[PDB]
């Protein structure tokens, strides 16, 4: 064949830290269908937002918003435990169906996005050029968000370890941990990946007695 229908830009959803996670890559032939399992960002999260995006940028805010919906009734559980299956199905007429189902509760929500939605030919060309020109910066943003999320994992696992340790953890150790947690918290608001990792390293240095407990 010398011609066929494609979806012209990547389609995905916003994930933790303001990043776009792709479900359907740009130039995929249509009809097409793809599913991916997601989980919750925070402990005890009972609702999630499915924000549908079109584009090639790593920052969710830089892509074209197609629509959004909420999925609630998720049993409050530790972060990473819920299994939220997100499906993107584009039919032969370019109609996009997005659904999200929580595997444990069976709760499901969906949206239909018309084929005419999104960016036009000139905006598609500008999106491709802008993604290309900002490739290094978008990579750096993605690396920062991963570090910010890992930074949060170390902050989360340390705090769980401290509460479990209780009275057994000495005062000198606990005070050094509390201050190092604050320094990490502050660096996380910044955009310097190395500064975050350094505050993570400083925390781990004062948590040696905590890891033993």
């Amino acid at each position: 064949v010398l011609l066929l229908d494609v979806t012209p830009l990547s389609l995905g959803i916003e994930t933790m830290g303001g990043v776009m996670t792709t479900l359907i890559a740009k130039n995929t032939t249509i009809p097409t269908k793809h599913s991916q399992v997601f989980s919750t960002a925070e402990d005890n999260q009972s609702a999630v937002t499915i924000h549908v995006l079109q584009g090639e940028r790593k920052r969710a805010a830089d892509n074209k918003s197609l629509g959004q919906f909420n999925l609630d009734g998720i049993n409050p559980a530790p972060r990473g435990m819920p299994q939220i299956e997100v499906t993107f199905d584009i039919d032969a007429d370019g109609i996009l169906h997005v659904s999200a189902k929580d595997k444990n509760s069976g709760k499901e929500q969906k949206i239909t996005i018309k084929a005419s939605s999104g960016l036009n030919e000139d905006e598609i060309q500008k999106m491709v050029r802008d993604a290309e020109a900002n490739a290094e910066a978008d990579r750096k943003f993605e690396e920062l968000v991963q570090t910010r999320n890992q930074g949060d994992h170390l902050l989360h696992s340390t705090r769980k370890q401290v509460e479990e340790a209780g009275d057994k953890l000495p005062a000198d150790d606990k005070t050094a941990i509390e201050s190092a947690l604050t320094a990490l918290e502050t660096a996380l608001k910044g955009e310097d990946k190395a500064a975050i990792e350094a505050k993570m390293q400083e925390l781990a240095q004062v948590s040696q007695k905590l890891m033993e407990i």
Partner: peptide, 9 residues
């Protein structure tokens, strides 16, 4: 006077 970039080539 702030300066403006040219359109992406």
């Amino acid at each position: 006077r702030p300066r403006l970039p040219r359109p992406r080539p």
